[PDB]
Amino acid sequence: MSKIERISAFLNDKEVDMTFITNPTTLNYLTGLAIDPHERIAGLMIFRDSTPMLFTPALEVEKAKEHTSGLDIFGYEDSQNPWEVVKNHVKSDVKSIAVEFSDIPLAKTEGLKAQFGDINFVNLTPLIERMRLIKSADEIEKMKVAGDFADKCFEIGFATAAERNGVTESDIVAKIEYEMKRMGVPQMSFDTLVLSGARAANPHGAPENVEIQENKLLLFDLGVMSGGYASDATRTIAIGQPNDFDAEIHKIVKEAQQAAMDFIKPGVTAHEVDAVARDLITKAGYGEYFNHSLGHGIGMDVHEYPSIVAGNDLVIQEGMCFSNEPGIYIPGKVGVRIEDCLYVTENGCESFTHTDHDLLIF
Amino acid sequence: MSKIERISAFLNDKEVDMTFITNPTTLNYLTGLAIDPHERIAGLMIFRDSTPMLFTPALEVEKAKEHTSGLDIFGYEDSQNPWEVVKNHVKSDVKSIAVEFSDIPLAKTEGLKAQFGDINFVNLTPLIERMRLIKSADEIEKMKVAGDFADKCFEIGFATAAERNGVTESDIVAKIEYEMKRMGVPQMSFDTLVLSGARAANPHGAPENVEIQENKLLLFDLGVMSGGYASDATRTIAIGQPNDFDAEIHKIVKEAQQAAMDFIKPGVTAHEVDAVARDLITKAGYGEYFNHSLGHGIGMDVHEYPSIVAGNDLVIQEGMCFSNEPGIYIPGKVGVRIEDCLYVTENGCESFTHTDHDLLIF
Ligand SMILES: [Mn+2]
Ligand SMILES: [Mn+2]
Ligand SMILES: [Mn+2]
Ligand SMILES: [Mn+2]
């Protein structure tokens, strides 16, 4: 199949003249263009039967020619009316435009009305989402790199905590993000969390500049962006010997996350995936301290679909990428979460991270 | 000078019953509360003649109460339809809504339309924009903090390239952002730029994993967020002895940048300010290698208004803060940008960054 013709198909299905695709992730998804226009206008225009068009800001125009996807391309100088400029590159004649209802500002939506008239708008986002839901092999390979970087992050974070010597959570975080940015990593995919001890039991918490508690556990939630794709991974380890309680809390979570992993294959339902991790934890008595969903989808964002939640009966299919991250957070005592993100394969599933799941001691 | 009141003044003058303000940055500015709901729904609600409300996600209600002004907070649970929760709270009686056209996605406006009828939307973004055009005294003081942090980044960053020993562009960057993260600056104000040699001519150039080139220039463009406001400065230096053809450039750029700082005061135009600098540079032959405006507004955002471009006949006034980044970029041979942001004093102007602009050697 073609991604752009799938959209084009949809346009003909819905009697929609063109699209004005504005979301940055979405343009990267559809064309390979990593562009942030900020205040200034950009938009991908896919037609029913007509060459697709790429409106970018003039300074951005030719490194959109680079990354060239048979797309036409044209810009505007920070002086003309973007919308006027676009009305005249479109040679007649528009009454319906599919837009990303999620993303498109009402100014952009009003610029187009000014030049094109009383137009209908149709929400492209659901199709985009449906497309993004299943990852092609290129997409999977780029995610595995992000996952590699996460595993590299765990080594760093573990090593850096073992050294103690008054080391704080903030210290861990920075040393991790430093080695990452050092290796060309453009940014993390979410705020790195190092939570020590009872503070890990607060899912609200974030790393402060506090010392690491000895003989307690330490939570590690981190992820990289690599090539516009996301990784998300958690590990909890022991700084020093654990107490026999937090050690079993880890065991329950760990088997839980491992049992869900052994379960996942095409045919199962997210609800059932959630149920496997959930049922074995509640059985152990901790169900009341596991009050987020088992997982979220991952791709170009740390959060997309499918959602692995009790209500959701979606049948898991080959190519879906989602996390699997059970937890037990006992306010004031311990918090343990073991997060892997995986991809469903023809026969089961494979993981994007590979660090040991065991309660390692440092 | 009460900001809510400024907006309620707006609503009454324009006979618009309510607002629904959605920009996360706008909500800090107006309330001092730094909330960002991501895809959750938040909205500042002002009325012609009634107490203000602030609608935030449940996860957020309890520090929109501490941490903020003291106006009427309420939230929603992911169980409820956020717009429904909004209409239930607004007794009488809406036929209109001022909203930020540069921010409110078509989804949120339609969410509002559903609970409210066919309502007239009115663009509050302009007023916001000019409210933010004129910085108060302590606004300027926060930005000094941001400026002082950039000066530090420049020092720390200078040393790291001097230590040669195969240190790359990305060596400097993460080293810089690491020292900011430890001084309490988790967030840079935009993507730190350390570019060596001819890569400096490239506008879209981003620090890669490439050795610091000996005997060429090294451009540092860095800035920081602290306490809600941002800084932006550029400095370019020499790595060892430069070829003083490259160094004649720095002498030009440096004197242009300086020309405009001495020239700026209340009364002259943003064009008159771009002219001063853009024609100390045409008058040195490199007229068509000045690829951009002389500077941008700055404040809570690093790119706000006013635009320092030739096309704008705006009269500068006291309280305006904006960039001053004249630069020469000769493809494949050199690029030199030297930038400062400044506030406009009673008669004259002061900079937020004082790091030496002269061409240093390391
Ligand atoms: Mn996750
Ligand atoms: Mn995570
Ligand atoms: Mn800059
Ligand atoms: Mn700038």
From TrEMBL, chains A, B:
Annotated Mn(2+) 2 binding lies at: 232, 296, 325, 339
Q: List, alphabetically, the InterPro entries matched.
A: Creatin/AminoP/Spt16_N, Creatinase/aminopeptidase-like, Creatinase_N, Pept_M24, Peptidase_M24B, Peptidase_M24B_aminopep-P_CS
Cofactor(s) in the UniProt record? Mn(2+)
Q: What is its EC number?
A: 3.4.13.9
Task: Write out the GO MF terms.
Answer: metal ion binding; proline dipeptidase activity
Q: Which UniProt keywords apply?
A: Dipeptidase, Hydrolase, Manganese, Metal-binding, Protease
CDD domains cross-referenced by the UniProt entry:
APP-like
Give the residue range of the signal peptide: none
Pinpoint the Peptidase M24 domain residues: 141-346
Q: Which family does it belong to?
A: Belongs to the peptidase M24B family.
Name the UniProt record assigns to this protein: Peptidase M24 family protein
Q: Which organism is it from?
A: Lactococcus lactis
Q: Which gene encodes it?
A: pepQ
